[PDB]
Design a binder for this molecule. Structure first.
Ligand SMILES: *C(=O)[C@@H]([C@@H]1NC(C(=O)O)=C(S[C@@H]2CN[C@H](C(=O)N(C)C)C2)[C@@H]1C)[C@@H](C)O
Ligand SMILES: *C(=O)[C@@H]([C@@H]1NC(C(=O)O)=C(S[C@@H]2CN[C@H](C(=O)N(C)C)C2)[C@@H]1C)[C@@H](C)O
Lengths: 245, 245
């Protein structure tokens, strides 16, 4: 089940943020959130979709192996951070959209649709273009669904080889310590339109000693100056819960 | 092929220390070292053996899976950092000797001996006690051999499932950034005499952007105060190579 902790809304009100944090100890059957209504509301996954897309890319053979280098041959890209050769992990961690847009094209509608059904990934709507359905198309996923999906990944229970799940998991390590390990992925759909804000994400899980905590955060956003809030608000909530001080 | 870099002896000489650093770019077919003769000399692996031990424990089912918890029975251990339940990653990173002595016994000699031949691990001599051959027994391995073994692990080419090579690899992650990942493990056999000295190790590999560097360091320890040099000497060489930063 899931519990509503209204105390957590303090971290949101202090910054006038409309968002939701979902936090789960040990498993998906012991979770809490600041907002039950928004916890199950479905939003564009934006770059958080690079997690399933990479798994599907390895499954289908589009990504030959974990050692494949995605070369940059000089085609101008929307951010200089993407204008370089990238590993699979690098492409994920810098959110190299063009790399994963080409992966999407090579996977194709049929295989993409099949794996999203197998992963129970959101509304499973890939309309809007095979290389943009997760960013400006019709794909939507809730914070609870992200936690469920990531828990499956952590347990190697996605319908894919354990090998490929493990490959993507190390690619998601963002903080490493002897008894403290974080897998996570951020997302940002843009600033949105007039009275249609964008969405920003932070999702992943934390392994502290022999315990695990899955989490998913999203917020409405209409300016890039608010991006750091997608990390600081959830980090403060987790710090409050003793998930490392 | 291995190249000698005489300039890399600066720090060794200034501290009056006998040791070797082996550093390889892309593959073990492009290695350089400060001392060609010592690069091939074999030494007690000490805790660096936890890497092969961890893999063998998984291959044989002694370690159930990536989520195995090693319980602390509450009776005293030599170090308070070990008096707790630990993941496989935790066991490796805090170098929990008693956990890996128990692993070895369950593996047994027939299978340990088998896998050390499969891995081409040093002189493959596990005399000295099934739970101590790598600490005070007859097992010996060279810096060159460590690099070869670690390269095989990086490539998933060891005679073991890719599954378990991937499990142990994430367990070895020590530093993480979007385009910089480090797998490494230290080891130290204890202070010896000026004539029969101990050995201190640093081994691992650095993934920087799309490049990979394999390294193995060891040094003779006949005074406990020289042990910090096991990190600073190789760190200085890798800084001068432009790998760090
Ligand atoms: C994914 O959602 C988009 C890209 N991935 C990320 C992300 O969520 O980290 C963004 S946000 C980009 C990262 N560095 C920039 C920054 O920090 N400032 C401008 C302050 C913003 C990308 C937009 C995908 C749609 O490209
Ligand atoms: C395994 O080899 C033993 C541990 N390995 C290490 C080591 O290589 O560092 C030590 S020494 C202890 C832990 N790290 C500290 C250090 O490096 N400095 C203080 C400089 C000291 C152990 C002996 C395991 C069998 O205990």
């Amino acid at each position: 089940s899931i519990t509503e902790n209204m105390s957590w809304n303090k971290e949101f009100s202090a910054e006038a943020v409309n968002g939701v944090f979902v936090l789960c100890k040990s498993s998906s059957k012991s979770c809490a959130t600041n907002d039950l209504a928004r916890a199950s509301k479905e939003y564009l996954p934006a770059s958080t979709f690079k997690i399933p897309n990479a798994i599907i890319g390895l499954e289908t053979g589009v990504i030959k192996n974990e050692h494949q280098v995605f070369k940059w041959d000089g085609k101008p890209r929307a951010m200089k951070q993407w204008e370089r050769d990238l590993t699979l992990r690098g492409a994920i961690q810098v959110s190299a959209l063009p790399v994963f847009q080409q992966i999407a094209r090579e996977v194709g509608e049929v295989r993409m649709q099949k794996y999203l059904k197998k992963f129970s990934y959101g509304n499973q709507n890939i309309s809007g273009g095979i290389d943009k359905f997760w960013l400006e198309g019709q794909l939507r996923i809730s914070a609870v669904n992200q936690v469920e999906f990531l828990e499956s990944l952590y347990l190697n229970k996605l319908s894919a080889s354990k090998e490929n799940q493990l490959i993507v998991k190390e690619a998601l390590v963002t903080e490493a310590a002897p008894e403290y390990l974080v897998h996570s992925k951020t997302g940002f759909s843009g600033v949105g339109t007039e009275s249609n804000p964008g969405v920003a994400w932070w999702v992943g899980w934390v392994e502290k000693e022999t315990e695990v905590y899955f989490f998913a955060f999203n917020m409405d956003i209409d300016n890039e100056s608010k991006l750091p809030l997608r990390k600081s608000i959830p980090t403060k909530i987790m710090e409050s819960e003793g998930i490392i001080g």
